[PDB]
Structure formats: structure tokens, C-alpha cells
């Protein structure tokens, strides 16, 4: 094409013989080409940080349970007809009994795959991102240092958690285990490369069992530990402690899991992964997962007993039953757009319009589609205020997936000396008030959050200009997706992770 | 890994069953999922403007040139020695006569492949793309339905530049006028998909010989049509016609045309090829392309003769020589950092910060690292005014190469009815001043410039802040790259450029 | 169903079952996921395929039928004008009750049809005695002694056939009238 | 240019809206912000331009 | 509303299953042919008057 190059190639070698693959992790300078423009102080931003950890923060659902005419009530009788017909006998529980310790066996589940991510995070090194393990264990809500002082206890304690969870009984034909576990137990690059950013996803709480005695059973929300808490083993043994602690030497809970042991095979459970003092994951490349992530839909903060909802009382997220109360049906509607204040965050009025299903390629099969949407969860109504005062906005949507997604949580350095880590925690939605310094806050978030590839499709609302921003993201072959798409979407998901091949 | 799927593939698949694959060039809504949500009315964003256009607006440069070790001042000598001394060629002019007979060329070799653009985009229709072909006429500065409504007289005038081109000789060797008409005459697709976006290339201007006579010889801008002007084939001819006025008349340009015809043959010079009423321009997918346009740097806009910037009287962009003047060396010295106000666009101090070069993959062959810094410019002091009232300020760089780019220009459709075209204005370096009426319109223009792959990369100056954000773009594989290594880069291109391999040297 | 020397196709067969015949075209991929999903929840249910009702029930509801065979022929079809409804007594037993169907030239959507499903199964689709006595009838007649359902494919297309056992029970068929409701208005016949 | 005579939903041109409509939207995933005579009313508008062009293109053949 | 059913028309049938108008140039010429069928169409061809217009006065028959 050129043939001077061709003449001499030493000139062309020695010119462009640049040091490329920084390493990420820190903060670099990039120096002034002009010497002079120091008297310009911040109109010269000569500053460069990558980011490398996006924390998806989940709370695993049912899904929405209005009536006994919902999905999991249906796999309740599903289930119920297939483990009463191997175990012959005098059952002393109903469907919902074993549906609610079904669904209290995916909480200890997900938490025995919470501390053996914490533990199988810290013998990860790489030369070339800095952000490993510190960043991915202050992700999870773990002083680091705790992990790497305390090194054999928090193996007994993550071998100990898979000896007493693993001593229940739950089967493994039922898909959502195997979800939950295949999110739970998963680091996972944005781009196949070496200096890759690293998604997580970690439960924003646990669903804790609570037998009400003759007015049914509860599961109520316990809340994990948030990015850069720096909870020590203390903090997750009494966090086990609790779960367990209505269950260990229970029984009812034993009857339970002896008749799903008998009628689904000892190959046909949930097996528990054991650590080694050797069990390290290493980040892998699943754009099967990337694309949930792209169509990911925050929810809001989930509301707890405690929770001050000026308007709203009585709205606190639980799976209940009651047998007095819509005909002993396994009941969850959560109440969605709650941020954890009472002052009304108004950037979830932009996640009122229909969403965009944003997906690579130009042929998309219908299982593609079906995950895609996992963690997409559109609002459909405002919720009904009791009293004519009410300081905050709730929403409900059409129906939800096993997942909802409640935060995203950003680990990257910090520009100014030392270069710490600095952590981010935000929606889909994101609010930039009046103010000075949260406009270029905004746009250092903007381009952090453009790093990572298929990262979630952001909307920002602005404070005097009154208005919000739509889908900020790279769009591909997309389309428009409707409430009514979406509930049918997630009605098939619903039906299709809680499915057991039956024999009845 | 759900077995759930497989056992019922038609409950998964009328369940799915999705629109998928929406025309770009209009606009859509999304609508609401709560319905209620009308009361909120502005604070819901239910529009969706995907950008079609973004065109580089460049100016053809011979390099950067201030004394006589100038890439173009040996390459002036190594041409003038072929064609005079190796050839016998006439004794009435000097090597910067030839050099600039030689830059001339270019600029009507790169008129050609403007209006031949300008021509095949006009025959561009599908189903898929409502951009094509209007928005691309609009971003090349025409009338979209002049175009239409005399295609007979733009074919033809195309073919009658190319013919009157065929009166001067330039070498075909010499890449300069190779990358030019390739770069001028080229629709680029972002990702090689069906409906993807459109880079495009425009000259900003060209350069007109002028004769001076005793005092010596300069090439002055033409400025060339912006996107909003709607010119028709008149206004090109007239173009045409200022550009070549001092070109056919001159007896210098008859004898260095005949000189190069004589040196060269006929068969080693540029020749302009004729096109048809069947010619068609297809845009292709260029990775080099992409990896120039991300990274380009943009200077600002050309200052002229009647540009009014107090403190700095004669700065105006000229390629000139002087036999006096730097002992008859040719000199293009240019200060960059004006955007066409006599004020400072303070946004341009976002750029006094060291670059960053960042690439698709991990490979970066030596030709992929000199292709990828063309249109990059870095700065490297501030000129110094003449007075003590200034109010610009002027730049001058560590060289550059054979263009620089002036600024882009963004084509998209537009948020309010009646849903018309946009046309946005834009350096690599964004003020955002405070006022309302700015932060959704940045926040805008942000999220239609990600929409193209490999844009250049952006920094934003918030006025109320008083600070600047840097890269503004997805790294990949990046170096920071000095004002030093950019200028050994850009020496290295300008050379390969002007080389003229038909001279039988061994070398 | 298309034929060019019959112009009642499909036009006269949608409106004579009571659905309105554009609806079904334009919205047919969620007709289709209807169909499939009262296919998915009504066959969780255990049933025994040795009981011939049930297979004389699927024989004439799925079934068009020429009363002379010919190409210009005339259809029969068979439509349901009610459909039993359970309801759980409680201590007073169970009951039956009519659920209508809609008639001919009702231009009934997609809704309506889900309202009347979503009826008829609200009482038994999640609930503990019904799927204990389904669970009880799979255990007593296998999985291959089971009543099945034939599913949609966006291909699945029945054709006129011909059957004189059928067009013998048209012929001595003999119409009882109307059902009698709770809310019919029968003077000096009460509770009827 | 007549798409026939047409007065109910049995005419051709209703029955071949239909049948176009089911293969444009449903059999291969089509938009849903328009019906089947809409569909159709853009195929006859095709068929005006289409025969706007064999007419100008006669009168430059005839010229000759 | 025709910009979308262009994309789905096009989705529908590929780009080779459209309405192809083909380019003419200098050289195009048409010649009259002989066909027997086009003469049996213009034989027993029966003419139906003058197309009704908005503006066209029809008394008796206001929209028509």
C-alpha cells in the first residue's frame, strides 16, 4: 500500500514501539502536552481511571403471587402431588409448607455460594489488574484483610455452612438452584481479554424462614452486608446463625427434607461445591449472562418492618401465607421504587416509559430472548398511598422473573492521592441535582459505567432542567418491549425454573 | 441448560415472537409502561433519535514546515532534482514552484472526489435506512433535491472536472494524492451490520494557488460548503472555477505541467476516472479507517485573511515560500485553536493534556500504530500574541500530519416534531456552559455520538465547575502517547506520503 | 382454512363459534400462546383416557364435517353453549354450574375467552384437594392411560372430513332449548 | 388501475390483505403500529409509482 | 407508518424478492412487438367514463 514502509522498515519498527496493556487498577497521569497549562488547573483534566467491578445486587423472588392462580402456588401442587405419591404415609403439611422450605433451601443456597465466592475471590492474582481480590471481596461487603488473617477459620466456617445445608433435602430437576447457583458461583469478564472488567452478582438479602404456628409460615427478608461495610466472620456466623436458626434441628423441617429425599433420588439433589484451601473461580467469558445484565432493571431498595414509608404503611416485601388469608395461597407482591429515604427520588419516573431490549447480532432465537429479559422489570401502575400526605412513590409492576435487581455497586480507584478504592452504588436511574460538583461526578460515573460492555442501560434525570434523559447506551438490533410482552415473558420463566418432571 | 425450554419449543417461541430490526432514520417512541405517568410529563424520556451521519471535516496539509529539513522541503528538492536535473526539464522556476504546483493538485483531485461523492450518494435508497441518501447530501453541504433534479448536470460535471484535470500532470506514485482521494471518497460503515452509521470525510477547504510574481508564491484557503448551506451545482461550478482561474492562464503551471508530463510519461500520472449513470458508491467497512477516526484530534477552524482575533494580526493559514523569507523554504506554520469567534473557546485547554491511543485488540502491527495517528494533533505551547489585549488563544502544535481535522459534524433525526434533521457542530473538546438548556442537550449529544463504534474521543468542560473531563470514550488496549512520539510518527507519514517511488532510484 | 370455491372460509366458522374473525388474525401469536397455555395448565390435570366420554367430547368438538363429500360441501361443527362450572360447597358438597359460551355474531376478543379460562379454572389451577385427587388418578391409570391434549403449532390446520356416524346423530338431533341460569326469569317455575 | 371491486371482507383485495398481513407480521415478525389495510393500501401505492415510472420511461423510449 | 412497513417488507421478502425498477441509458430503446393476447384484451375491452372527482358537479349524486 505504501512503499516507503516497505523501504524502510526500521524507521516504521523503531517509531511505533510503544508499552501498551496497562495495567488496571490505577491511577495514571497523563502528563500535559502543553507545559504551560498548569495556570489552568482543572480546565486540564490529566487524569485516567479504569474501573474494574460492577456488582449486580439481587434479591431472589418467587415471582408475583397475587391468588392461588400464580405460578409458584402451581408448582406448589406440582411438586406437593409429586413428593406425597413416593412418600406414602401421613403427611403432617400442606403445599405451601414445602414450597416455603423449597424456597428458604435456595436462600441457603445462595448464601453458602456467597461465602465460597468470598473465599475462592482471595487467592486470585493477576500482575495486570490491581483490582484483584481486594476489590471484588469490598464488592461483596468483606474486609479483605479479615479473609487473609483469619484463613482457616472462614474454611471451617464455609465447609461447615455446606455440611448443615447440605444435611436438607431439595431437588435438583428444579432449575432455579441451578440459576441461582450459576449466578451466585460466577465471575465474569465483559470482553474476552486479560484486562477485562469483572461482573458479580450478590444477594441484596436472604428470605428467612419464620414458622407462624397455626396462622401459617413467613419469609422475611435478611439484609446482606453493602459494598465497603468490612464485616469480619462474626458478622456472617451470626449472619448463618439466624438463617439457620429455625431449621438446624428441626422436625418439621427434617420430615420435609427426608420426604423430597425419598422422593427425588440422593442424584437427584442440590449438591453443595466444598472448598480445599486450592478452590479458586477464574473469570469467564458468558455473554448468555452479559445480556441479562445489559437489560438489567433496577427495582429499588426492598422495604423492611423497620422501613419509614410516610403514606405507605404496611408495604414490606415478604412471601406469606396464611391460611385465613387468600385461600392459604403463597402470597408475594413487593412494592417496588423505594430508594431507602422518604423524600421522593424522582429519577424513577424515567423508568415509566417502555424499556428497550437491546441485543447483539441480527438473529436472536427464542431461547436468547427468553434470558435476555431476566432481569428486566418495567413498572406498570403507582402504588395506592393510605392518606392524602405521602412522601415517597411506589410502583407495581407487571410480574418479575426469580431475580430482581435492587442496586449496582462500581469499584474503581480514586483520582486524588491515595488512590483508594471508590465505591458507587446507583439504579438504572440515576438523579444529578443542582449542584456543582455532581455534574462532572456524573460524567466520571458515565464514563465509568461505559467501560464495561454490556453494561446496563442508564437514564438520567437532571434537576433544573426538569426532565430525564432516556436509554443511555450503544444500541445494536433492538426493540420496544410492552408490560404485557414482558409478563408473558416472565409468567414462562416463572413456570419454567420451578417446573419438576413429575410422575404424580 | 433449562430443560423446560426443549420440552416446549412453541410456548417459548409464540412467547418471544418480537418486532426486531426498526428502520434508523426516523423517529420512535417508546411509550409508557405506566400510563399514569403523563403528569410527569418531561421527566419521562419516551423518545429514541438514532444518528445516521458523522462527518470528519478536514484540510489537506503538507506536514508541518518552518525551516528547510520539512518533510515537503525534501521532498520539494527530491522531486525538483528528478524532474529537472534527472530529466531535463526547463530553468524558469524553483523547487518550491514545483512543490506547490504539486500541493495545488491535490486540491483538485480532491474537489473531484468531493462532487463524485456527492454524485453516487445521491442514487442511494433502502428500505432499512431513512438516512440514505438526504442526510449524507446535508452533510456534505448540498441541496438534496438540486441533486435530484439535476443529476444529468451533476454526471457530467463530474466527468468535465475530471477532463480538465487531464491539462496538468501530477505522479501517481506519490501516496499523498492516493490517501486523499481514497479518504474523500469513501462511506464508511461503524460496525458491518445491516443499518449501521456513516463516517464520512469533507474538506473544510482546499488550497488556491496565487502567483505573486517577484514575491514569491502562496496557497491561500477556499473554503468549501459547511452542512447547512443547501448549495447547488452552481455555487460548485463557481468553486470550481475560483479554484483553477490562477492555474490555466499561468505560463509557470504550463511549463511545470509539461515538465512532470515529460519526467513521469503518461502512464505515471494521477488520472481521474471517468464515471457513468450505473456508478455506484457502496459503503465498505475499513478498520484502519476507524482506527483513525477514533483518536482524531481536532484543530479548530482555518484562520483567513478577513478573521477578526485581537492580539494575533497576520495568523492567517497559508502555504507559503519567499525567496528571501527562510532562504525560499516552503512554510506552513499554522496556529490552531480558533473555532471562528473572536473570544476563547476555553474548552480547548481540555486538550493540553497528553493524549491516549487506544486500539482494537492486543496485536498493534508498526503500520496498524502510524495509521492510527493521522488525524491525532496534539498541542505544544500557546502562541504569543502581538499587543497586550488578547482574547483568543492560539496553539501551536509539535507537527502533524497530512490533514488535521477542523471539527465534526453529527446528522441525526431530530426529539420534537416534525421530526427534521439535526445538524451538530462539534470539536473533540465540548463547553457546557451553565444554563438549562445545556446539560440534557450535552447529555444528547453524548448518547448519540456512543452510538458510533469508533468515534473520537470527547472532553467535556463544564462552565460551572470550571472543569474538565478527559477521555470520554471505552479503552481497549491504550498508551499515552507524547507530544515527541506523535511528531516522529507524523515525520515518518509526511515522508512516505510525498515519496515518489517512479523515480528508478535502487534506494 | 382457505379454499377459493368456498367462500365461507374461514370467515363463517369463526363467526358462527362466536369469536370475532379479525381479532384472531391480527393478534395470533398471543391466540396461539393462549391456546398452548390452557393446553399446558388443563393437561397438569389427570384424567382417564379408558373413559370414552371424554374422547366422544374431543370427536365433536374437534371436528368439521361435510354433509356430502364434495369440494362446495356444507360444515357441520359442534360448539358448546355452556360449560360446567365447579365450585367447592364446603360442607354443603360441590356443585356444577353453568358457565355460556358465546353465541354466533358476538365478536368476542381474546380478553373474553381468557375471562371465561380464567374462570373456569380459578377454583382448581393452584388448589390442595384437586391436585391430590389429580395426583390420585395418575397413580391408578398410568401416564399412558391418560386423557392428552393436541397442541398449536402455527402450522396445525383441521380439514373438512367426512363422517356418516355423525351426520346420523345431526339428523335425529333434537333441541332441548335454552339452559335455565339463577338469573333466568321463569314465572311459576322457581328454582329450575 | 382497479385493486377490483370490493364491498365486504370477502373481495380479493381483502382476503389477499390477509393473506400478505399474516406473512409480513406474523410469519416473520413484523411491527404491530399498523393492520392488514394498511399493509395493503401501501401495496397499491407501490403499484401507482411503479406504473408512473413505465409511463415516463415510455415517452423516453418513444422520443427515439 | 410506511418507513416501518418498507423494513418489514423488505425483512419479509430479502432484498432479492422485491419490485426491482431497472436503469435505463441512452442506448434504451423500445420496439412494437405483435402480441395476440394484449390485441384479445383491447377486443371486447369495454370502457366505464370519466373517473368522479371531488370537484366534479354530478347532480344527484353529491359524494360519489
Known sequence: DVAWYARYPHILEEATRLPFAYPIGQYYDTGYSVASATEWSKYVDTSL?????????????????????????????????????????????????????????????????????????????????????????????????????????????????????????????????????????????DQDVTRAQIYMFKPTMLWKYENLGTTGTKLVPLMMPKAGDNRKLVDFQVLFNNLVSTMLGDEDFGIMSGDVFKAFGADGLVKLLAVDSTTMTLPTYDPL????????????????????????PGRQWQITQNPDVNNGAIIFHPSFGYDGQDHEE???????????????????????????????????????????????????????????????????????????????????????????????????????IIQFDWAPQLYLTYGIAQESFGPFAQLNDWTILTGETLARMHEVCVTSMFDVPQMG
Not at 392462580?69 to 413428593?83: G, K
Not at 489488574?129 to 484463613?151: H, I, S, T, W
Not at 449472562?289 to 405507605?312: D, K, M, W, Y
Open 289 to 312: 449472562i452479559l445480556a441479562q445484565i445489559h437489560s438489567a432493571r433496577a427495582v429499588g431498595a426492598p422495604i423492611l418492618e423497620t422501613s419509614t414509608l410516610t403514606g405507605f
Open 346 to 448: 424522582l429519577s424513577f419516573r424515567a423508568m415509566c416509559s417502555n424499556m428497550i431490549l437491546n441485543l447483539p447480532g441480527e438473529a436472536h432465537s427464542a431461547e436468547m430472548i427468553i434470558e435476555a429479559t431476566r432481569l428486566a422489570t418495567m413498572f406498570q401502575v403507582k402504588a395506592v398511598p393510605a392518606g392524602d400526605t405521602s412522601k415517597p412513590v411506589l410502583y407495581l409492576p407487571n410480574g418479575f422473573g426469580t431475580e430482581v435487581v435492587n442496586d449496582y455497586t462500581m469499584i474503581s480507584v480514586d483520582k486524588a492521592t491515595p488512590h483508594d478504592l471508590t465505591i458507587h452504588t446507583f439504579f438504572n436511574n440515576i438523579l444529578v441535582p443542582n449542584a456543582k460538583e455532581n455534574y462532572v461526578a456524573n460524567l466520571e460515573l458515565l464514563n465509568n
Open 49 to 189: 481511571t479504569i474501573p474494574g467491578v460492577m456488582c449486580v445486587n439481587f434479591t431472589p423472588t418467587p415471582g408475583e403471587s397475587y391468588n392461588k392462580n400464580s405460578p409458584i402456588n402451581i408448582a406448589a401442587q406440582n411438586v406437593y402431588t409429586y413428593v406425597r405419591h413416593m412418600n406414602s404415609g401421613h403427611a403432617n403439611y400442606e403445599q405451601a409448607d414445602l414450597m416455603m422450605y423449597l424456597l428458604a433451601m435456595d436462600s441457603l443456597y445462595i448464601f453458602h455460594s456467597y461465602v465460597r465466592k468470598i473465599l475462592a475471590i482471595s487467592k486470585l492474582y493477576t500482575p495486570v489488574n490491581k483490582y484483584f481480590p481486594r476489590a471484588l471481596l469490598v464488592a461483596l461487603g468483606v474486609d479483605p484483610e479479615d479473609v487473609f488473617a483469619n484463613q482457616a477459620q472462614w474454611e471451617y466456617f464455609v465447609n461447615m455452612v455446606a455440611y448443615r445445608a447440605g444435611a436438607f433435602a431439595a431437588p435438583a430437576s428444579m432449575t432455579y438452584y441451578e440459576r441461582h447457583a450459576w449466578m451466585s458461583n460466577g465471575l465474569y469478564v
